[PDB]
Amino acid sequence: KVFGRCELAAAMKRHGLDNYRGYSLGNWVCAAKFESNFNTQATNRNTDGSTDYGILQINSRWWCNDGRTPGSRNLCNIPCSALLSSDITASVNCAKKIVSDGNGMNAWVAWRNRCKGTDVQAWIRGCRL
């Protein structure tokens, strides 16, 4: 599913991401924009053989099982395919664990490089929330 901007902001708020670990909703929307362009079916293969999945491009090295990332973990206890669902529950729940890991949203390199320190509120501007 490709979400609209405000549609995703609302879904993320529904699932409790607004101000989760102190990160305002705009941060989460901005991260999703640049990770996946709001596409739940987004995948990207990494140089190390791990794969990133879903709207927030969550990596199989640590967070999900895809059966093809040697030596990896599955800390969110889910198949990586769950991260591709039209239902964002699994992505959100796993993102909560990731952002609690110690480095906050810096875990998402695209957030650090493209969202961090910008006017992220613009991402939810105009949305009915």
Swiss-Prot record:
EC number: 3.2.1.17
Domain of life: Eukaryota
Cellular component terms (Gene Ontology): cytoplasm; endoplasmic reticulum; extracellular space
Description of how the protein assembles with itself and partners: Monomer.
Active site: E35, D52
InterPro entries, per the entry: Glyco_hydro_22 (IPR001916), Glyco_hydro_22_CS (IPR019799), Glyco_hydro_22_lys (IPR000974), Lysozyme-like_dom_sf (IPR023346)
Reactions catalysed according to its record: Hydrolysis of (1->4)-beta-linkages between N-acetylmuramic acid and N-acetyl-D-glucosamine residues in a peptidoglycan and between N-acetyl-D-glucosamine residues in chitodextrins
Function: Lysozymes have primarily a bacteriolytic function; those in tissues and body fluids are associated with the monocyte-macrophage system and enhance the activity of immunoagents. Has bacteriolytic activity against M.luteus.
Annotated family: Belongs to the glycosyl hydrolase 22 family.
GO biological process, one term: cell wall macromolecule catabolic process
PROSITE patterns in the cross-refs: GLYCOSYL_HYDROL_F22_1, GLYCOSYL_HYDROL_F22_2
Location of the C-type lysozyme domain: 1-129
Annotated compartments: Secreted
Disulphides: C6-C127, C30-C115, C64-C80, C76-C94
Misc. remarks from the entry: Lysozyme C is capable of both hydrolysis and transglycosylation; it also shows a slight esterase activity. It acts rapidly on both peptide-substituted and unsubstituted peptidoglycan, and slowly on chitin oligosaccharides.
Naturally occurring in which organism (per UniProt): Gallus gallus
Protein name, entry field: Lysozyme C
Transmembrane segment boundaries: none
Top-level EC class as recorded in UniProt: hydrolase
Entry keyword set: Allergen, Antimicrobial, Bacteriolytic enzyme, Disulfide bond, Glycosidase, Hydrolase, Secreted, Signal
